[PDB]
């Protein structure tokens, strides 16, 4: 809500993003894809994201509602299907952090919900 109390919002997002990390069992999302050693990534991918730059975007605020949270950690998890094939470790991981977090994800929201 746009009246909510912002703190304990935000205290909720971390435990998520924390919880959410956990699943990176490839340690492939926790750091920015390095470009030094894919150049062409940013060809394919508009937006990068992964778990620090999430954590810096909520301790910046700018996540104010759940969905835009929830949005980030979807590209983490789309941009890595659509730059990798198929056959890949990467992709094999994302499709894995798309089955974990998203229990996650639904447990957290039914928090967030309560603090409208
Ligand atoms: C999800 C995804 N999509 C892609 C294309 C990639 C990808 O190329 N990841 C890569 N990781 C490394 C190594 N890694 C080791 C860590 C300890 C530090 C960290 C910055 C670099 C090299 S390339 O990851």
């Known amino acids: 809500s746009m009246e909510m109390q ?32 894919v150049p062409d ?8 994201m992964d ?10 605020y700018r996540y104010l509602n759940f969905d835009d949270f929830e949005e980030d950690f979807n590209l983490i998890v ?9 056959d890949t470790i990467f992709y094999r991981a994302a499709v894995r952090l798309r089955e974990q977090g ?3 994800l639904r447990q957290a929201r039914r928090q967030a ?3 409208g």
């Open 6 to 37: 912002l703190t304990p919002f935000l205290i909720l997002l971390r435990k998520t993003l924390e919880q959410l990390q956990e699943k990176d069992t490839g340690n492939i999302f926790s750091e920015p894809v390095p470009l030094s050693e």
């Open 78 to 86: 789309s941009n890595c299907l659509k730059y990798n094939a198929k």
């Open 113 to 115: 919900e309560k603090m």
């Open 41 to 48: 990534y940013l060809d394919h991918i508009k937006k990068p």
């Open 102 to 104: 998203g229990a996650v």
């Open 51 to 60: 778990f620090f730059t999430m954590k810096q975007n909520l301790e910046a």
